[model samples]
Target: QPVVKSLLNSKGIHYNQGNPYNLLTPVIEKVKPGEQSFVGQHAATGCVATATAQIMKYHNYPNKGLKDYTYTLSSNNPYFNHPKNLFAAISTRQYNWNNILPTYSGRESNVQKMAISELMADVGISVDMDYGPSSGSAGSSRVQRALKENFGYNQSVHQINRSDFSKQDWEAQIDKELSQNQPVYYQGVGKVGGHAFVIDGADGRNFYHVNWGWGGVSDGFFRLDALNPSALGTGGGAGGFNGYQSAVVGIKPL
Candidate 1:
């Protein structure tokens, strides 16, 4: 993939736009992904949402602040008591107000939940307002659904064993996506199970820079060949180093 290599400034931090780790720069200070606490939720369940939020920022729709998207529910609503929520009414309007009210959990409706649900509905995926984090962590299917519905993008789900592609093939696939400026979503397992992040760029040698979605840990990068060997059973070299059980890419048009 071609890297831009253009210098840019944000908050006095100098960085290259095409650098694999550029998001670490101050340019993304406001849009960088963070923990779900900002949304009044847990990171474990909100990773998908957080990653999606990062995608939004990448697409020039940064959330700005919770207050920017925050609103209250009506008295007739089930979660009306939990009025301080992000994009609550928006989700209600996209779906049904009555259907979404009950989906709110733990005193607030999850932004990630609403986002996934809204996207699924847009793409003709039969999702209930309670589809996402409220049920559990967001997975590849949900992520794919959101990308297709909300962003007008399509995705390809890749499993180490599910497809006959070699490790180099997988790497090439990611490189192609990054070259096109599309971020990839990865779901890790084993020591890294139940966690997800957006892979923004690759160093072309050893690391794939990522957005951790936890508000505090943006710009984190991981080994390019860190896939779990046991799960993949690919045997030796880069193929054996699979850190995640599966990965999906949001295919963007050239």
Candidate 2:
């Protein structure tokens, strides 16, 4: 976690609004002008890449990927990966996502500005993201697995879903990761659609810190009972979506 803080500071970015407990990962957004950033395998930024990029920033990993990797499109991105353009799935550049991320604030640098594209591209391409109307989202498993498949991440990513655990159990799972200083990558699918986020830390009472990947605009600590919703858990939500579909835990670069 020290590495995450140091990297953002080193890159001249204001993080967590100067409030240490507000977040666990640094703030990075792609929804604004000048702040507009990130390129995908076939489209633009999405919550999947945004969440992955933030976690990558947390780990400060790879520095470079293990090697140039390529994948063939199976489906998912019907619009962008259509025609004959679908062959190269998981399209990665010679560059990597290990570079630091930046915000709209502070003395910005070339690398910092470029970092938004580089880091987001790295994660989105790695997961073979599809930005179609019915696509452009990454599941919990895909995101965690992409960290290993694309960047050769040297740790195991365990997947946790509400289907297999009670609300209390799910909360414990996230708390487990927090206790070990590991931030969990979570994707929640609500009645409307799905979105991804990072569960940075918890307040010890019941509320856990969530980074919505939108430059941390609405990010804050939400109670797990509402966020991860158990059988008896409330129908409330976080970051425009409700119901914690699943999460990739045990995520820390080694």
Candidate 3:
């Protein structure tokens, strides 16, 4: 995982080489046991694509943007579209740590797809997969199907109603969780289906997250500074699950 850490630590590095069909192989071959990988459906496919393209260009790939980077991963590039591709790309890249793939649980698959594209840069891969329903439904029910079929997963959806809570309390809670090596997936930010990262036991001054809407990494500190727990699972909070999404798992460790 040294390479993984290296890539994460540094930004603006290029990673476009080999055939698009197999560019991720070097990343996928590195998966190991005791590691957890998360993928969010409808997370933000376009963002992921943009980040990947940036990495490729940074690496000095010619015409890598449109040619190598497809807006929507198609059957032509199964690895880029399939959730399994996360594992494949990570393993191939020798990033065989725990890979977490988080996607929106419903019709928001498009957003999840974009997120995946962006986060791929963290581990060095490009994906354009989006979520879809077997019946083309738009509400929460349709999301359930998209999650089960596309992500091959089933978890209870979570919602956190927006509210006002003490910033100190939120920081303490996040700190305690990190001290114990715990990760929490939250919902109920707003209609944007918000997602973020807050490492347990880290500093209350900073937390990291890979958001779907804004794409890339966002850090929130002091609890209420940028994100509020009370506002989580609520309809009026910063763009969260819109009271319609779920927290598929809890964060454990890297």
Candidate 4:
């Protein structure tokens, strides 16, 4: 008999005991943002790319690994492929239009890279116009567009405050999506700033196992209470927590 290791929450409570599709069971390969050799090292600023890789893997793409896809997309140099170039192109456009630079530093020389906005442009989901200083940062709309354009998966974006739903309501929504084997892209805002990750599974209780784009930092059961919604500007409710400001649910085919 195979002894399955259960995932624990911040309080050390075990979850996902008997499920076959348990996230902690190694069914889905864990991916990191940096090069395969230096996993998770650049995840802090490469979160959008990291999350993109997870989504691709969940959809069972042929090249699910980050290194392969990234190289294909941005590898123009002989020595190395610069995935950050994708970010640089988009971020500069945003900076020009919004007058806000949302770039952040990655591992070494890849400093002030763009956010999800660049990803949107790269995948033909959105058009960003800026020849300079456009560190791509984006909202839920961009995520929805990207999923639809890239994977043929239609998605819905829920803004924390706009939707007058309870915590249970939001959880049920997430549950419904995951039940269909769909992954949810979530954005959070905290004291450190904004970050993004994917929610792939849950314990039917108070935790959702998040694939923290920062390698496997919180790649386990994350408690609902530990999230700070107020900081996220999502208002006080069940829909807003775990640093959730907005969520994008990729609607699976019937």
Candidate 5:
């Protein structure tokens, strides 16, 4: 999480009054009258791009005088491919939900990288398409597999199956991820391609996550505890939290 480190290292940065995504408004106001700031992508890589472009356009940058950098990436640059670079670049870019998703695609991490690379090319952001691990696995989440055909990738982490449903069983697999501070993705069973998010915390009852939805709707705390039993879990016979069907997580760190 070098990107996370870098973002934290920038001690002066302040999250919005109540939400983390409100970062743009203050950033735009703080920059010099004529200067422009580069943008960065966050968990909601899709929204980060869109929001940054919007802010830049409103501030009047050289390209299109507002609405300049559309949130689409269509270039070939190692920065996009290199995880270290990806963190750095995203840390400095804008966080917009609309621009981020266009770059999203595929199931395998490699394919996701390729899709982003292809998309960045169109947006003028050079991104690299080559990385190590190449084995693309099958669907581990109902939402991920279901949307695989449409979005190109699973927005959340794959689930680990458990035979026992006791309190101890839940803590064994999920507790470690939560205690060590793991990332989770937001998902729903709705048909409108529900927005994706990163889960920062969770208990047996709810999922705590973040997303750059929109104004006042930006990054903040959220709890998803009302999902239907069938909607939240997997296979028909599967029961308990193990049945949760919709979600997303970050790229597993190598």
Candidate 6:
């Protein structure tokens, strides 16, 4: 019962290489036996972690983290529970691990999924991901810092709240990042749940390319306006999962 089937997958959006402005999109492949697929067949690990992992692959930074990252998971988190939102009273769980290994450097169709799986786990722990119904999420500040401290990245990343700027300004900001080769990390709030993904390109107008982090499912170019308020969402007419949107911008590492 998803509030909205994701604006990226909604009508009036462009999929594949159909967008007017051609942009390079990361074709992320799903890996197994690690974080990503460990919970697959049942549920996704967490969009935030998974999305960031994809971005990391785009830049392939650090090759290793500066220090080991340690984080915890709520025993009650869905990952520990089961289907039907089981209300199990489990204790908190902790995980500590070395930095991420070098990201896979092969064609999207023929790469190692395990490397991706490991990177996803590192992203989750580094950000202290909170696993809930929305899978898992972390604040922008944590992700910004985690990229620098844990992954040894030096570039700066900033988070933009949709309400903080005019719609035109928001769209322009996304454009700037994409034009500069910085893939944007984005998320939206629906009525009850939210999702996180990557904005990989910005075509003229409000259209932008998005990767829904579902292993390329429902991924394509859509209007920022589409993710706004709609009859389905609080804003009504956006028909997206949520009217409220946020993003981590200026993210490309050398």
Best by lDDT: 2
Q: What TM-score would every model get versus the actual structure?
A: 0.48, 0.68, 0.29, 0.48, 0.29, 0.64
Query: Residue 88 CA error for candidate 2 (Å)?
Result: 8.3
Please, what is the whole-model Cα lDDT of each candidate in the order they appear? 0.39, 0.55, 0.29, 0.40, 0.28, 0.53
C-alpha positional error of residue 101 in candidate 1 after TM-score superposition, expressed in Å: 26
lDDT of 5 by residue, 1-254 (tens): 11121111121111111123222221111222354532232222233222222222221222111122212222332223222222123213333323322222133254333333322221222112121111011123432222222222224435443333454654344444445444433333342223323334343444432433232233433334332233333455532222333433322321
Off by more than 4 A, model 1:
1-45, 61-135, 154-164, 216-218, 227-244, 251-254
TM-score, cand. 4: 0.48
| Minimal lDDT window, size 10, model 2 | 17-26
Tell me the lDDT of model 5 at 157: 37
Q: What's model 1's lDDT at 69?
A: 23
Candidate 2's C-alpha runs over 4 A off are 1-42, 67-81, 84-99, 132-135, 228-240
Measured on C-alpha atoms, candidate 2 has an lDDT of 0.55
Per-model C-alpha RMSD: 13.6, 8.9, 15.8, 15.1, 17.4, 11.7
Question: Across residues 1-254, which tens digit of lDDT does each residue of candidate 3 receive?
Answer: 00011221133222211222111222322222354432222222222233223322222221112112213323432223343333222222222111212222335344343333333432222232332210011222322232233222224322222343354544454444434433333333444443322221233235433222232234233223334433334555453333333322222211
* Candidate 6 stretches greater than 4 Å from native: 1-43, 78-111, 131-134, 228-238
Error of 5 at 229 (Å): 20
Q: What residue pairs clash in candidate 2, if any at all?
A: 130-136
What is the lDDT ranking, best to worst?
A: 2, 6, 4, 1, 3, 5
Task: Return whichever of 5 and 6 wins on TM-score.
Answer: 6
